[PDB]
Design a protein around this motif. Structure first.
Motif, PDB file in Angstrom:
ATOM      1  N   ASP A  13      -3.601  15.993  -5.332  1.00 37.65           N
ATOM      2  CA  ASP A  13      -2.889  15.195  -6.272  1.00 37.65           C
ATOM      3  C   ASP A  13      -2.524  14.982  -7.977  1.00 37.65           C
ATOM      4  OD1 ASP A  13      -0.481  13.617  -5.324  1.00 37.65           O
ATOM      5  OD2 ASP A  13      -1.285  11.456  -6.289  1.00 37.65           O
ATOM      6  N   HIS A  14      -3.187  15.920  -8.457  1.00 41.20           N
ATOM      7  CA  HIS A  14      -2.825  16.292  -9.530  1.00 41.20           C
ATOM      8  C   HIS A  14      -3.380  14.852 -10.290  1.00 41.20           C
ATOM      9  CE1 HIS A  14      -0.432  19.576 -10.834  1.00 41.20           C
ATOM     10  NE2 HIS A  14       0.301  18.767  -9.610  1.00 41.20           N
ATOM     11  N   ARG A  15      -3.768  14.453  -9.578  1.00 37.77           N
ATOM     12  CA  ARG A  15      -4.864  12.491  -9.704  1.00 37.77           C
ATOM     13  C   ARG A  15      -6.560  12.703 -10.819  1.00 37.77           C
ATOM     14  NH1 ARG A  15      -3.421   8.099  -7.074  1.00 37.77           N
ATOM     15  NH2 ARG A  15      -4.963   6.540  -7.516  1.00 37.77           N
ATOM     16  N   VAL A  51       0.456  -1.058  -0.185  1.00 37.36           N
ATOM     17  CA  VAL A  51       0.273  -0.218  -0.226  1.00 37.36           C
ATOM     18  C   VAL A  51       0.630   1.479  -0.061  1.00 37.36           C
ATOM     19  CG1 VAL A  51      -1.503  -1.314   1.624  1.00 37.36           C
ATOM     20  CG2 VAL A  51      -0.919   0.995   1.972  1.00 37.36           C
ATOM     21  N   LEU A  52       1.817   1.596   0.821  1.00 36.33           N
ATOM     22  CA  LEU A  52       3.254   2.121   0.644  1.00 36.33           C
ATOM     23  C   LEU A  52       3.333   2.313  -0.316  1.00 36.33           C
ATOM     24  CD1 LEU A  52       2.843   3.543   3.556  1.00 36.33           C
ATOM     25  CD2 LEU A  52       5.081   1.207   4.608  1.00 36.33           C
ATOM     26  N   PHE A  53       4.189   1.376  -0.974  1.00 36.85           N
ATOM     27  CA  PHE A  53       4.684   0.928  -2.315  1.00 36.85           C
ATOM     28  C   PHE A  53       3.612   2.298  -3.760  1.00 36.85           C
ATOM     29  CE2 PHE A  53       7.903  -2.051  -2.254  1.00 36.85           C
ATOM     30  CZ  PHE A  53       8.860  -1.232  -1.891  1.00 36.85           C
ATOM     31  N   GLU A  54       2.908   1.344  -3.570  1.00 40.12           N
ATOM     32  CA  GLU A  54       1.754   2.154  -3.920  1.00 40.12           C
ATOM     33  C   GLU A  54       1.531   4.042  -3.846  1.00 40.12           C
ATOM     34  OE1 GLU A  54      -2.467   1.358  -3.341  1.00 40.12           O
ATOM     35  OE2 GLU A  54      -2.978   0.873  -5.008  1.00 40.12           O
ATOM     36  N   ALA A  55       1.360   4.475  -2.203  1.00 42.56           N
ATOM     37  CA  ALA A  55       1.078   5.624  -2.389  1.00 42.56           C
ATOM     38  C   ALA A  55       2.615   6.632  -2.496  1.00 42.56           C
ATOM     39  CB  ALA A  55       1.590   5.524  -0.937  1.00 42.56           C
ATOM     40  N   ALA A  56       3.588   5.989  -2.844  1.00 42.08           N
ATOM     41  CA  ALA A  56       4.903   6.798  -3.457  1.00 42.08           C
ATOM     42  C   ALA A  56       4.468   7.364  -4.514  1.00 42.08           C
ATOM     43  CB  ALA A  56       5.599   6.149  -2.971  1.00 42.08           C
ATOM     44  N   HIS A  57       4.747   8.314  -5.154  1.00 44.17           N
ATOM     45  CA  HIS A  57       4.618   8.898  -6.750  1.00 44.17           C
ATOM     46  C   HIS A  57       6.383   7.492  -7.138  1.00 44.17           C
ATOM     47  CE1 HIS A  57       3.237  13.145  -5.228  1.00 44.17           C
ATOM     48  NE2 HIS A  57       1.742  12.031  -6.016  1.00 44.17           N
ATOM     49  N   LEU A  63     -10.329   7.558  -2.752  1.00 45.87           N
ATOM     50  CA  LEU A  63     -10.322   9.248  -2.393  1.00 45.87           C
ATOM     51  C   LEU A  63      -9.306   8.717  -1.218  1.00 45.87           C
ATOM     52  CD1 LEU A  63     -11.047  11.399  -2.697  1.00 45.87           C
ATOM     53  CD2 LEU A  63     -13.237  10.783  -1.335  1.00 45.87           C
ATOM     54  N   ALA A  64      -9.530   7.245  -0.569  1.00 45.50           N
ATOM     55  CA  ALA A  64      -8.675   7.340   0.936  1.00 45.50           C
ATOM     56  C   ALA A  64      -6.950   7.251   0.765  1.00 45.50           C
ATOM     57  CB  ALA A  64      -9.186   5.799   2.093  1.00 45.50           C
ATOM     58  N   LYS A  65      -6.795   7.051  -0.581  1.00 45.26           N
ATOM     59  CA  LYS A  65      -5.846   6.699  -1.016  1.00 45.26           C
ATOM     60  C   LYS A  65      -5.262   7.739  -2.159  1.00 45.26           C
ATOM     61  CE  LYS A  65      -6.425   1.626  -1.980  1.00 45.26           C
ATOM     62  NZ  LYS A  65      -5.585   0.747  -1.533  1.00 45.26           N
ATOM     63  N   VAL A  66      -5.599   8.449  -2.382  1.00 46.70           N
ATOM     64  CA  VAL A  66      -5.048   9.217  -3.251  1.00 46.70           C
ATOM     65  C   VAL A  66      -4.633  10.217  -1.422  1.00 46.70           C
ATOM     66  CG1 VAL A  66      -4.902  11.257  -4.948  1.00 46.70           C
ATOM     67  CG2 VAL A  66      -6.621   9.816  -4.765  1.00 46.70           C
ATOM     68  N   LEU A  67      -5.107  10.409  -0.761  1.00 44.61           N
ATOM     69  CA  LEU A  67      -4.917  11.331   0.392  1.00 44.61           C
ATOM     70  C   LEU A  67      -4.372  10.715   1.040  1.00 44.61           C
ATOM     71  CD1 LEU A  67      -8.956  12.865   1.859  1.00 44.61           C
ATOM     72  CD2 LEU A  67      -7.210  13.934   0.720  1.00 44.61           C
ATOM     73  N   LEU A  68      -3.577   9.212   0.908  1.00 43.81           N
ATOM     74  CA  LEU A  68      -2.755   8.723   1.401  1.00 43.81           C
ATOM     75  C   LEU A  68      -1.621   9.278   0.778  1.00 43.81           C
ATOM     76  CD1 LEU A  68      -1.206   6.765   3.902  1.00 43.81           C
ATOM     77  CD2 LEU A  68      -1.641   5.044   1.777  1.00 43.81           C
ATOM     78  N   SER A  69      -1.872   8.733  -0.580  1.00 43.72           N
ATOM     79  CA  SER A  69      -0.662   9.761  -0.711  1.00 43.72           C
ATOM     80  C   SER A  69       0.223  10.600  -1.225  1.00 43.72           C
ATOM     81  CB  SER A  69      -1.180   9.233  -2.765  1.00 43.72           C
ATOM     82  OG  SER A  69       0.224   9.913  -3.723  1.00 43.72           O
ATOM     83  N   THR A  70      -0.810  11.768  -0.313  1.00 42.70           N
ATOM     84  CA  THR A  70       0.103  12.671  -0.639  1.00 42.70           C
ATOM     85  C   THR A  70       0.517  13.592   0.734  1.00 42.70           C
ATOM     86  OG1 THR A  70      -2.469  14.395   0.369  1.00 42.70           O
ATOM     87  CG2 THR A  70      -2.244  14.223  -1.662  1.00 42.70           C
ATOM     88  N   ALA A  71       0.286  12.327   2.093  1.00 44.88           N
ATOM     89  CA  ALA A  71       0.763  12.238   2.737  1.00 44.88           C
ATOM     90  C   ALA A  71       2.224  11.535   3.242  1.00 44.88           C
ATOM     91  CB  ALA A  71       0.659  11.291   3.969  1.00 44.88           C
ATOM     92  N   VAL A  72       2.270  10.470   2.931  1.00 43.26           N
ATOM     93  CA  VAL A  72       3.643   9.380   2.085  1.00 43.26           C
ATOM     94  C   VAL A  72       4.669  10.479   1.345  1.00 43.26           C
ATOM     95  CG1 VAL A  72       4.462   7.591   0.414  1.00 43.26           C
ATOM     96  CG2 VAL A  72       2.282   7.501   2.648  1.00 43.26           C
TER      97      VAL A  72
END
Lengths: 211, 211
Positions: B41-43, A75-81, B178-187
């Motif tokens: 996140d430009h998503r 899930v983290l790997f996915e999250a990283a840009h 949505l919880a993944k895009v929002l998690l992605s801006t944190a990571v």
């Protein structure tokens, strides 16, 4: 491929009132009857490993644990840009990339003491004073950087680990809920200031001087 | 219940090279042909509103947009701990609690210019210099705090908004993604330092002096 996390559950006195942990408590508390688990955000529904051993150090309780959850890395790997990690990493990192992500996202550990213990939580920063942790891919490496921890102590943990059977057990949580617990640690920490400065000093307090 | 966001897409010159936006570009670019969208996140798969108007200010492009996505408030509300907001809030906040969460999690806006524009991204901090934004529940309130923005300008946006039909359109994204895009801006922002200090000064640059 697992991760070993090691750090002090609490520093004798320093952590302050209430939270304060002391010897009458430690010694009574260990060896803990119930195999203590490691979850994220104190989420009972989100356990990702288990403390394999806790000793009593001159400075405080020192623990070692195993975080073997395949979903936690996915899930983290996915999250990283697409560019977290340059190509300078392409030509060098494998699962150390999981380790790099997890160390910076979840740097501290929270001992939800029951009195004696219950569970260890992974989080940004904890209520206690030396709660910064180190993660690596071998027990002797998680503990390798604590400059104050006696070789006599380092030794003791390493042995207890050798007993520990179950170092195969893979903790499965579910990406969909994992992404919510991990999003929850961000939301509930967005306002904290000098985040890395706090983690800077908790690190120095634990003896993680390494460098 | 919608949120209106208003801020400068870019400050003439200040944002620096490449990123730099200038009048030959602005004036040519507006009025934009394609109704410009607001995603996180430009998503492209994560749009949650749409820029309802962009004018050209003495200082730079100033925009107003609508973020009307029921899911965006639900996932965040879920993420916040049982005690984000004391009881001092119980006795006072309703949807202003959504607004409180979204303002602190996603404080900046990123204009993915195509040359002229494409889409506006919500994020922690943007590449540009006055990209901090204000959110509220009425167009005249989103723009109310920019101390430099002329009443003549504030006026102009407010009218354009009155034309804008579609202020009902509810953008639906899906909690799970949505919880993944929002998690992605944190990571992808965990390493940034003086986060709130950066946002402190981008705020002062935009004229959001309000207080």
């Amino acid at each position: 491929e697992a991760l070993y996390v090691a750090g002090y559950l609490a520093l004798y006195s320093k952590d302050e009132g209430e939270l304060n942990i002391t010897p009458e408590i430690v010694r009574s508390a260990l060896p803990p009857t119930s195999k203590i688990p490691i979850n994220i955000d104190h989420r009972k529904d989100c356990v990702v490993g288990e403390v394999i051993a806790i000793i009593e150090d001159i400075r405080g309780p020192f623990f070692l644990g195993i975080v073997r959850c395949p979903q936690l890395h996915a899930v983290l790997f996915e999250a990283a840009h697409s560019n977290f990690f340059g190509n300078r990493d392409s030509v060098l990192s494998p699962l150390e990339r999981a380790l790099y992500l997890v160390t910076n996202y979840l740097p501290s550990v929270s001992l939800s003491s029951k009195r004696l213990f219950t569970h260890v939580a992974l989080c940004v920063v904890g209520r206690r004073v030396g709660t910064v942790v180190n993660y690596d891919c071998t027990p002797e490496s998680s503990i390798e950087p604590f400059r104050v921890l006696s070789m006599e102590s380092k030794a003791r943990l390493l042995s207890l680990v050798k007993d520990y059977a179950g170092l195969n057990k893979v903790w499965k949580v579910s990406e969909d809920k994992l992404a919510k617990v991990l999003l929850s640690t961000a939301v509930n920490n967005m306002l904290l200031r000098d985040r890395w400065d706090v983690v800077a000093k908790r690190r120095r307090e634990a003896g993680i001087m390494g460098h």
